[PDB]
């Protein structure tokens, strides 16, 4: 724990806050919330404020469905760009059946649910330490995004100087005050694609931060009059934005993946995570890569992975094993992207990893020789299977896979699937402009 009630009421009073958002994340990642006047705070912290439950199912929701709203006393965070009528603050609230039971179908709880298996399984903390990249567009007078990059930058370059620009700064330094912890940052590979990195934390505390982040960027990026966008592969033929995910299974304040006395100094345990994850690679792809565009981001070349294989030195692999050991021995999974619902990506990544540690699987052999010099049919001879080519070729793998269907419950697995074939189906019955640049003059 961190803040007790009298600690929150001490700041509402002192710091003087007049409004309180009660955040919670839905099924498609949209960060939603009901909003209560500071006048109601009491009733809230007693866990009594209620809302239409179906709002989480997203668009495929169907019935008013009363849900109560427990505020994680600790998440409390007061925004600074607010003044004017009192300040504003937010409690990320877990969800609870009208008879006080957790709501099986809320992303966030489901993670606490799967990390239950994790402590039921002997482990102490399953640490995420994300690398969320992004893009910035220059708003139009009508205050609307455009296809205009905020800069013509490149890799780690001295992106827009100390002079006037660097939204990264206003973006970075801002996050400082709010209690964040930024590793570093640097301009990324494509013109106006920047990257910020925090320090690691248990999945709960972290996926809460990817959400908060996405807020603070999008809202700080606007003060600067520039569109921010975590979309996956916004432009065609330009670096996609990805959400590199760094996983470290501990046990006894001790990094389990570590084993000096061994090969790569990876614990046999760490081989179980890495192997088990390679199995359902293409299965949970649909989730960590939940959108239609992710697949225009999953093209060979732009440094974005496609093929299921692991190493520590190879271009665009699916699982990467960073070089630093000791406490920092971690299994980076590079297929994820910002579109991905944090709580949902972790649930499937961990569970897919926690499969390997309870049926003790066998890592297949790292690919260092290279797959991008091999052909599709050649890599196929070994444990190398391409990733899907669509949110659709993927859904057929996330459905088929009985274990993911155990990371997302009969409820969440259903409505995630419910929703993504109306998505995919919305995008396949359309008649895009390329289809005119191809078939109107010729045919």
């Amino acid at each position: 724990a961190k803040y007790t009630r009298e600690d929150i009421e001490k700041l509402v009073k002192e710091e003087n806050v007049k409004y309180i958002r009660l955040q919670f994340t839905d099924i498609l990642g949209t960060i939603k919330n009901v909003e209560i006047p500071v006048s109601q705070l009491g009733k809230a912290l007693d866990n009594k404020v209620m809302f239409d439950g179906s709002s989480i199912e997203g668009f495929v929701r169907i019935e008013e469905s009363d849900m109560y709203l427990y505020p994680d006393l600790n998440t409390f965070v007061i925004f600074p760009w607010t003044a004017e009528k009192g300040k504003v603050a937010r409690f990320i609230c877990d969800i609870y059946n009208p008879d006080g039971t957790p709501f099986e179908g809320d992303p966030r709880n489901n993670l606490k649910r799967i990390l239950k298996e994790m402590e039921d399984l002997g482990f102490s903390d399953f640490n995420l330490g994300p690398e969320p990249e992004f893009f910035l567009f220059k708003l139009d007078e009508k205050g609307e995004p455009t296809l205009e990059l905020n800069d013509k930058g490149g890799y780690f370059d001295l992106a827009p100087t100390d002079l006037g620009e660097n939204c990264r700064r206003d973006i970075v330094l801002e996050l400082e005050e709010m209690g964040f912890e930024i590793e570093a940052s640097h301009h990324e590979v494509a013109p106006g694609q920047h990257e910020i990195d925090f320090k690691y934390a248990g999945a709960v505390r972290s996926c809460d931060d990817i959400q908060t982040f996405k807020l603070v960027v999008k809202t700080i990026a606007r003060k600067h009059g520039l569109h921010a966008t975590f979309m996956p592969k916004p432009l065609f033929g330009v670096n996609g934005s990805g959400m590199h995910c760094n996983l470290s299974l501990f046990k006894n304040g001790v990094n389990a993946f570590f084993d000096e006395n061994a090969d790569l100094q990876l614990s046999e345990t760490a081989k179980h995570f890495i192997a088990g994850i390679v199995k359902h690679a293409t299965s949970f792809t649909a989730v960590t890569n939940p959108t239609v565009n992710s697949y225009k981001r999953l093209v060979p070349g732009y440094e974005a992975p496609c093929y299921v294989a692991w190493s520590a030195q190879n271009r665009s692999p699916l699982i990467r094993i960073p070089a630093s050991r000791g406490i920092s021995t971690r299994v980076e999974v590079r297929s994820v992207d910002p579109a991905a619902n944090p709580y949902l990506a972790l649930s499937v990544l961990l569970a897919a990893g926690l499969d390997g540690i309870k049926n003790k699987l066998e890592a297949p052999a790292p690919i260092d020789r290279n797959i991008y010099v091999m052909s599709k049919e050649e890599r196929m001879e070994n444990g190398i299977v391409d990733l899907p080519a669509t949110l659709a070729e993927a859904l057929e793998e996330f459905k088929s896979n009985e274990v993911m269907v155990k990371a997302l419950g009969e409820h969440l697995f259903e409505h995630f699937i419910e929703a993504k074939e109306i998505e995919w189906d919305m995008f396949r019955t359309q008649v895009h402009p390329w289809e005119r640049e191809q078939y109107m003059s010729q045919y």
Binding site: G58, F59, I422, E423, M426
Partner: peptide
């Protein structure tokens, strides 16, 4: 029935 308003319920959710 519901499939036309939902059909609408969805059109704006997805635009």
């Amino acid at each position: 029935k519901m499939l036309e308003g939902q059909n609408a319920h969805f059109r704006y959710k997805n635009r």
